[PDB]
Amino acid sequence: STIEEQAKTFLDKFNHEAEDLFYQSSLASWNYNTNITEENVQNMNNAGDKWSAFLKEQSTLAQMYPLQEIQNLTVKLQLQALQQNGSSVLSEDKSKRLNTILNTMSTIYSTGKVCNPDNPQECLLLEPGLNEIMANSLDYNERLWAWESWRSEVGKQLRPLYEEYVVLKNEMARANHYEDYGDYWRGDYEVNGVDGYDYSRGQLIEDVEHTFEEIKPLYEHLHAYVRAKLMNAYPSYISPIGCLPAHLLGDMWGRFWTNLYSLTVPFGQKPNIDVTDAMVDQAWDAQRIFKEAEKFFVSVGLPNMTQGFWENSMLTDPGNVQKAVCHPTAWDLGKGDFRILMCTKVTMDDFLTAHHEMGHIQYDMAYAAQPFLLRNGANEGFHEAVGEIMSLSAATPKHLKSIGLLSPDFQEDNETEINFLLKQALTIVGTLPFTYMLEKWRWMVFKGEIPKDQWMKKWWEMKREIVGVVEPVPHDETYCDPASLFHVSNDYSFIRYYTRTLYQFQFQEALCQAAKHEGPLHKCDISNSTEAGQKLFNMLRLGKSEPWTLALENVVGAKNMNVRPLLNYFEPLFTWLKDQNKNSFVGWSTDWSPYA
Amino acid sequence: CPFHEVFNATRFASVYAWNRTRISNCVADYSVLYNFAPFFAFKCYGVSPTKLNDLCFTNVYADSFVIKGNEVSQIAPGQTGNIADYNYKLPDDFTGCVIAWNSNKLDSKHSGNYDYWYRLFRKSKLKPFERDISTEIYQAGNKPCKGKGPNCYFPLQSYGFRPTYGVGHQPYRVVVLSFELLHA
Ligand SMILES: *[C@@H]1O[C@H](CO)[C@@H](O[C@@H]2O[C@H](CO)[C@@H](O[C@@H]3O[C@H](CO)[C@@H](O)[C@H](O)[C@@H]3O)[C@H](O)[C@H]2NC(C)=O)[C@H](O)[C@H]1NC(C)=O
Ligand SMILES: *[C@@H]1O[C@H](CO)[C@@H](O[C@@H]2O[C@H](CO)[C@@H](O[C@@H]3O[C@H](CO)[C@@H](O)[C@H](O)[C@@H]3O)[C@H](O)[C@H]2NC(C)=O)[C@H](O)[C@H]1NC(C)=O
Ligand SMILES: *[C@@H]1O[C@H](CO)[C@@H](O[C@@H]2O[C@H](CO)[C@@H](O)[C@H](O)[C@H]2NC(C)=O)[C@H](O)[C@H]1NC(C)=O
Ligand SMILES: *[C@@H]1O[C@H](CO)[C@@H](O)[C@H](O)[C@H]1NC(C)=O
Ligand SMILES: *[C@@H]1O[C@H](CO)[C@@H](O)[C@H](O)[C@H]1NC(C)=O
Ligand SMILES: *[C@@H]1O[C@H](CO)[C@@H](O)[C@H](O)[C@H]1NC(C)=O
Ligand SMILES: *[C@@H]1O[C@H](CO)[C@@H](O)[C@H](O)[C@H]1NC(C)=O
Ligand SMILES: *[C@@H]1O[C@H](CO)[C@@H](O)[C@H](O)[C@H]1NC(C)=O
Ligand SMILES: [Zn+2]
């Protein structure tokens, strides 16, 4: 006769309907992903349409129960997930316009190609094509040509579309009793209810600013070292004190700096660790790699793979008879169906990717007991962090020596550790400012502090002030540079990566401390340590049923984001950089530009 | 004695309409079912089987269930849950044996075995050895009800068994031999 009982019954019905519908959709999607055939596409389309129709029908009936009359803090989260008007607040024509504009943007991004001048019959796509030029070329004019071209052909065909996209998304966000679309995305971290763990939507900006204010010295030293080393490959293109050009970062946008290892290696004479020859000399296969990964995961006390996973999940490419999409992915079809889809080769990179995907599968398997609506991570950053901690822990030389893939007489020196630390730093430390700046610019644009005619005047201005990169050619308001990315042209958030990177090192430090480890953090293996696994389990099985602050506190011991473990992980590299660059200058000035 | 028709049939009944199969007028030889049917579940809460020669049964009842995987633990005295409270309730002083076995090879289908049903909603609790076949719609609000639509919901929902489910979701043919010793 109350409202709580009616809400409970409604969720009870929805829980049993959604399971069957979602399982049918997921099975159809997997069947399509295995092959490439017309009837599979037809089945996938039918299943997806049915699932979307059911979800839309069930969404409407959930608004009858007021949110203020229910005090349970568990069904309230599910109702809040269901009571959300998706895009129906506006009129039908506006919704149709929004769907059309999104589809047009996606189509424009997907099928964009650039042609070499005076050669209309020779045109290259982004992948393959421009990516190979960006990642494997030491020339100067070619890199600048590709960098300017791709943006010139793509961004101007997306900017007018993006203006209407922003306007309509703001209209929908205000219709949904929010401030803007940026507030709509920041709401993922919002926690209301139980006292002592509240997290307002506006606290995220302050937390990110405070945490990033501490990373600056290490990034400054790394930037100075990279700038000093790159003056040997481009002698007359890098300022002694200026900012690094964005077209010489080994990537189209500068997201990662991994492709600069061959230019900035400290000791090129001593080789790195590569067990590919050991893998070949003992006749290893994909099954052996996967069983070794399973052994590593069971070494810490976690459960192992279900029998069906060894049957329904393909491990190697079928060949020319079939046609699949080789892309690693952990599939949770529901109702006890967990699968891995990856074409495996005998290589160390696959040896680490298997661990990453199996960590994904373990995390998915952890929270199978929760209701359907709560079967996800605490936020949008826990999942990849749990995946990546195992990958970081499994590459230690001690583990390689223990499993017999390396010579027992290989005397590990204090010179290869610097190489490994630098290689890890170039791909971990060098991406946080980029993500932070992109999210800050997007939030400022959505909020309204930046008028429509002052977009790019800020976009290149923040770069020089944060990332330390300068545009090689001037730009006007016609260009839309951020839309060239996959996560900007298509509607996707970008603050996931910063939080994931900050969480992974904190978790690694907590586990290493719990494992009674003595020495530097970079030589830590969580193998043969039960105490290092059970603690992690306390976070694995919670899911979305509890605020992310409580989940983070259950492992690390602190309820807020922290950066000290990240700097502790790179301490000897920091000392070596401090010793090396005593005769150089740290810092950059925003006055030097390549074009002026 | 008929155990072949009781254990080796093509189709069984749903849990909401469980067949109270009557066993009578014969000699107990189910040891072949030890070997022919590898019962993975065998729990006897009453007398020991070794005492079964001292007292035999004539009007004994048998039950045929088709339920999920993570549910055989719910078929036990003193247990709670959806099936125990709405579908089949055993008494605290239960003298019988629960037996279950996997049935992927003959109770699962690629399309879906939409032939086994189970109760979900009811405005009361059950009592030991009670069966309900009612199909009237369930009321949830104050207003009187005629047909589905608003809060009113239908009382029955079917299963979706498939051969590629996990161990906890594959159908288990569960003979809850709740054979009553006190009545025979
Ligand atoms: C908010 O609602 C949830 C359910 O939506 C409540 O959680 C439920 O709490 C009850 C206890 O009141 C649990 O019942 C269990 O019953 C078995 C019967 O044997 C008993 O052994 C257990 O110890 C337990 O009492 C029920 O499992 C649990 N369900 C879930 C999904 O959590 C929650 O208590 C409500 N919040 C408040 C503050 O009451
Ligand atoms: C988005 O969700 C909100 C609820 O969170 C929906 O608001 C509800 O919309 C209905 C229909 O417009 C309103 O019913 C009407 O209310 C007026 C004023 O009370 C009354 O005079 C009419 O007879 C009719 O009952 C309802 O009040 C309103 N409730 C709230 C809390 O806003 C909205 O419809 C959703 N938008 C969609 C689905 O596009
Ligand atoms: C985790 O512990 C196991 C068990 O002690 C280690 O495997 C042993 O390695 C030693 C190497 O000296 C062998 O002598 C033993 O035979 C191995 N155990 C078994 C059961 O064969 C394993 O090396 C440890 N892993 C790490 C990373 O330290
Ligand atoms: C995949 O394709 C092959 C031939 O192209 C076909 O024999 C097989 O049944 C297909 N399987 C699925 C799941 O579509
Ligand atoms: C790990 O996998 C092995 C291989 O089947 C299995 O015997 C063992 O039970 C698994 N460990 C756990 C904790 O499930
Ligand atoms: C390694 O240890 C040696 C000890 O002789 C020391 O001279 C050297 O500075 C240390 N660091 C590197 C990078 O070699
Ligand atoms: C059960 O049925 C199968 C199929 O008809 C048959 O092969 C088998 O012998 C039967 N066993 C029993 C219990 O008689
Ligand atoms: C119950 O089982 C008996 C014996 O096999 C059979 O004669 C009868 O038709 C069944 N009744 C129902 C309701 O399934
Ligand atoms: Zn991942």
mmCIF file of C-alpha atoms in Angstrom, chain A residues 289-290 328 342-356:
data_model
loop_
_atom_site.group_PDB
_atom_site.id
_atom_site.type_symbol
_atom_site.label_atom_id
_atom_site.label_comp_id
_atom_site.label_asym_id
_atom_site.label_seq_id
_atom_site.Cartn_x
_atom_site.Cartn_y
_atom_site.Cartn_z
ATOM 1 C CA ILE A 289 50.200 -18.517 -22.913
ATOM 2 C CA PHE A 290 46.621 -18.585 -21.639
ATOM 3 C CA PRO A 328 41.003 -8.279 -27.905
ATOM 4 C CA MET A 342 41.580 -12.338 -29.476
ATOM 5 C CA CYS A 343 43.826 -13.586 -32.283
ATOM 6 C CA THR A 344 46.936 -14.728 -30.417
ATOM 7 C CA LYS A 345 50.536 -14.821 -31.639
ATOM 8 C CA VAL A 346 53.754 -15.890 -29.928
ATOM 9 C CA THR A 347 54.993 -12.503 -28.699
ATOM 10 C CA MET A 348 55.595 -10.766 -25.372
ATOM 11 C CA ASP A 349 53.022 -8.097 -26.262
ATOM 12 C CA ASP A 350 50.341 -10.776 -26.556
ATOM 13 C CA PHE A 351 51.742 -12.314 -23.362
ATOM 14 C CA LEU A 352 50.813 -9.082 -21.558
ATOM 15 C CA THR A 353 47.539 -8.494 -23.426
ATOM 16 C CA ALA A 354 46.334 -11.920 -22.279
ATOM 17 C CA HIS A 355 46.895 -10.877 -18.660
ATOM 18 C CA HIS A 356 45.053 -7.586 -19.245
#
